[PDB]
Symmetry: D2
Subunit: 331 residues, 4 copies
């Protein structure tokens, strides 16, 4: 019962480091490049620095302080040796198999459990650690999704605002660091905005993060939606939640409430703070959501809350977190 990663990219590599630093052992790693490039990308990372440990590689492996790890370049899921490596849980992070209909291929090649690191489709269950994980059935579920980084920042907040003040309606905006899914200079893209130079523009882009948060929380079904603004930053994001509660409240109420959750039930997932912070202050923070108290606004029953989150490292800690759970309640 070992882990495997398909899509050793931005998310893959972060999840790997976390799993490493936790003890979990990754048996195989598949991507589309030669193990040389994989070793160099793991070793030197532009956002989180050098890999804590020794990195080596040959035609068929990668070595992490000696321990070998199979590294393949198979672009067809069904053709990945998850079998002859004993890989049970797979972290599908290529961003191209976001639907069980296709990601099932990992099972019909060995794997016993598959975690899609992105908003999936036709999966067994989309889970947001801290919102609906206890709702995982090892018998029934086998193809999971860890939702999206935005969903993971919204959910812990919408949950607390529900079991305290109740939520009628909510619109949200997220100012998000760019990702490899955008373009460096104007170039073809299916989204005519993500096609524009990413480090030059503030780019408006759709996000199902909100509606998706309406599934892990049926409470907000059809009554929660949002927008996204890609901005010139390599990592780090903030969610702008504007929700109409079910009773007039004050910004100070809202906070002590989210603060409560932070230091109690949602501990480790949600965090609360009143410090004068900026983006670079939350980069590499494990949490899913970090509430900026001082920004909390409240005009009667119409509240506005802000939640910082590192769309890369934080999300990756949840993905690795999910692999632990799946392994603890394996099949």
């Amino acid at each position: 019962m070992k882990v495997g990663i398909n899509g050793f990219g931005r998310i893959g590599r972060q999840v790997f480091r976390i799993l490493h630093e936790r003890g979990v052992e990754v048996a195989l790693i598949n991507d589309l490049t030669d193990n040389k490039t994989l070793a160099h990308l793991l070793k030197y990372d532009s956002t989180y620095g050098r890999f804590p440990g020794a990195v080596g590689y040959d035609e068929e492996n990668l070595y992490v302080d000696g321990k070998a790890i199979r590294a393949t370049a198979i672009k067809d899921p069904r053709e990945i040796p998850w079998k002859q490596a004993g890989v049970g849980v797979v972290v599908e992070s290529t961003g191209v198999f976001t639907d069980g209909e296709k990601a099932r291929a990992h099972l019909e090649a060995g794997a016993k459990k598959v975690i899609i690191t992105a908003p999936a489709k036709n999966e067994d269950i989309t889970v947001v650690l801290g919102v609906n994980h206890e709702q995982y059935d090892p018998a029934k579920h086998h193809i999971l999704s860890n939702a999206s980084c935005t969903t993971n920042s919204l959910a812990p907040v919408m949950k607390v605002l529900e079991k305290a003040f109740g939520v009628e309606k909510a619109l949200m905006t997220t100012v998000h660091s760019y990702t490899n899914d955008q373009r460096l200079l104007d170039l073809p893209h299916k989204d005519l905005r993500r096609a524009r130079a990413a480090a030059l523009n503030i780019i408006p882009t759709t996000t199902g993060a909100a509606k998706a948060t309406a599934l892990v929380l049926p409470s907000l079904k059809g009554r929660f939606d949002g927008m996204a603004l890609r901005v010139p930053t390599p990592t780090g994001s903030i969610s702008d939640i504007t929700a109409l509660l079910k009773r007039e409240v004050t910004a100070e109420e809202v906070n002590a409430a989210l603060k409560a959750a932070a230091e109690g039930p949602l501990k480790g997932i949600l965090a609360y703070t009143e410090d004068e912070i900026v983006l670079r202050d939350i980069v590499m923070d494990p949490h899913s959501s970090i509430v900026d108290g001082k920004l909390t606004k409240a005009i009667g029953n119409l509240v506005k809350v802000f939640a910082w989150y590192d769309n890369e490292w934080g999300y990756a800690n949840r993905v690795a977190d999910l692999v632990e759970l799946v392994l603890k309640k394996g099949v």
Copy 2:
């Protein structure tokens, strides 16, 4: 009856170019640097390119295609020769005399009318062209304020949402390009966030833009507030308006309504569009507010509207616009 500029900086220089390209003649220009540096900053601009025309200078002047303009380096308002230059209307844009209590000094030195390009204090009237300009009394008013770039983007929108759907409550967020008021690297500032590296961070900062918009529109008094997020872009900004109307509406209603205003009463100030645009698409757009139709969201009576605006050039067109009005109804 000629114009004068105090604070030949980012805003000053843009207002100058506009006034030039319109025919208006600036008699004197005061700042804190030698006329050499002034000539070089006007000539070569990093955002709007080279100055359309010939730029020269000597110990006492600047020359724009020959025509001389007095250029002084007097840091004390009362000591600026607005008198011996016949300067009637002054554009106070140093960002340091934002209150008539101090900006009055321009009058007790010559000037007959003073326009503060920023949220003023103790001024005669803060005006937002297209919202409450017809309310200018040349007899009573003499020290005006053109509000702020954010106010000028919000007002034209809040106005339309009032005379159509009525507004109960509204919270707004603005993702704003950085300004010379922030820091390049971490450095001392009265705001512990604007103190952080501006091209590196997404920086949360307070904005009275909303409450200020509650003055040009008493309708929203005490029921409109917002936040600001400084992001790594040199110019261009977007306002995120989340307002609770007085009746359930649809995003398509909201648009055709703002669109109406755009092509009618608020023409020239407000613009509406459905094109797939990004930040660099609105840089140097004269308008005060440009509605991004496609981003318009509506869950019943809770709406979310986005308005692009070039906090520099657009605002500067309003400032120059205000100088025309003041000159047309001079004293």
Copy 3:
């Protein structure tokens, strides 16, 4: 005898606009995206602004102020209808057919002349307008290359330093804006440096620009090489030329010499200036090389010269310039 473009990207689109604004008519445009995306990329450009004119499109065309232009999505050269469109000269700018061995396919499908906008291989002649264009034989040549933007900035300089002071040896460095060939965040690349986040790093990368300049100028064969440093800027570049002359000279000599060429023989290609400029000052400058006089250094016979150049617009003016020549001396 009409023009055609294959690879309607960064360079393609700029060459198109130039050809348009010059009168030249492009008959067909091939790329890998739907004509919708092509129309949107031409219309709104993040660096050079909106396209001067009306842009429309349908399943089979693009319309520029009415005039229709065939727009296909054929990824196989031999399969492009250069025939049934009467396209004589083709601008191969996809960056994937940089060798006549493959780019010849444009001929065996219609075209009578092919211009490769990049360092080619197996081409008939690599030309650098102003250095060796008069050496074009319409009878023999049919597959040309316009070299590279770096080559086009170096050549006009190395030429002048040869026919004046003679050149023994020269090493050069270019600080170049990033290009679509690099990555937004760490990601797989054949060059383990261009694989790193482009807007975050200063990235060292090999450049054959120098050795290539040794072909258009056999004088420097085996005695000229250089390096390239990709830096966080979307467009604009500077070449750092360090050459050991054949006689001790002074910085003032070097300048008046390059200045001479600028205002004389190399006019229109090379420019000379002593103004205090920065990058944003040369963006969209047609020239191939713009000498920054004030930076000129000289310790005896070891000189250092700097040349600004807009790797996009300037190069594109040379590409369009080359299409004129090819058309003037067509086949």
Copy 4:
């Protein structure tokens, strides 16, 4: 015999952290802001992260894990209580007292030794650890300078190229991250280039780093000069050294030579590497100079060498390093 810092800015704060993590105790810290802002800038740093330890403050002090440190806001050197605090060695890093003629004021107020963290004037001795530190006379010297970050990167290299191949002439170029000395948007500056938007432009600026390196190494007197190019990066820089040796050599010779020095005599100051690195890979590297082997070029006796260096952290390690030496051989 305790240390003191005047100018708790970018350099000051880094030197403080290093001195802290080394055990050295700073007695007093003077700047121009309230101890609140000082505590917040030390605590949260945009480039090097959170301060390793607890940070507190009151009207008269700062607390580092309890231990109190006097924090004043005296803009006049002679008026700093270096006396009633027993501060012997002062780190003058305000960037405004770069000449003993003025920095002497620290002595006539208490201090027994003053280190100017920048190219000084009228100082007793400018030292570059690893080049000419053993040449420090505690009896004669009392006002030192640690040179500049560029000087500290060049010197260790020029030294090795002298005691191996000899150096006839050398021109150098440095691509340097911006600093608080530049501007965020176009704004008045004595240097008409550093006046332009720093995160938007590649900015050419003079540097005495080379001539300065000609003092710590009289060998290159009048035969070494260079240029500087400020680029859009918050920290990290690379030096481009083009030197004409006294004998034809090969790039492989040059390297093994610099490599030798790196692992031997210049260990800890100079480093050598052949790894495929980019800027973000050297941020926070203690070294003064890190040679990028792979970039080494050599055409006979004309060589080109590149040296990475973190103009902030590395230089700060040298400054702290110098305070140790001064304390070990105190007065």
